[PDB]
Amino acid sequence: GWVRPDLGELSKVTKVKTDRPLPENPYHSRARPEPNPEAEGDLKPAKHGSRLFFWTM
């Protein structure tokens, strides 16, 4: 009592109702480095302008 699978029918992707728990860390990844100190605040005029050599502004 069997049925020949139709062409393409057997290649269909399928869902499996396994009861195995999800692998939390499949790659065994470690702790990741924390991000760089983020940027915040508002842009205010540069104090005393360029401040390069004698340029007052």
Partner: protein, 63 residues
């Protein structure tokens, strides 16, 4: 002009130049600290972005 002109005006020259002087010294050392430790907004060099990597299942299982 009297002495209150040049006196208060020279004060302004010195105070502005002193703040400029100390800001320069801070910048030299801040730039040094940023280049050495790297935990700063600038002096950060390009790294490969994650979004380029692909998480789709591959042909081989062990990946």
């Amino acid at each position: 002009d009297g002495p209150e002109k040049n006196y208060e005006k020279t004060m302004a020259i010195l105070q502005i130049e002193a703040e400029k002087a100390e800001l320069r010294l801070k910048e030299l050392e801040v730039r040094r600290l940023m280049r050495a430790r790297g935990d700063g907004p600038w002096y950060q060099y390009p790294t490969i972005d994650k979004a380029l990597i692909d998480h789709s299942p591959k042909t081989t299982p062990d990946n």
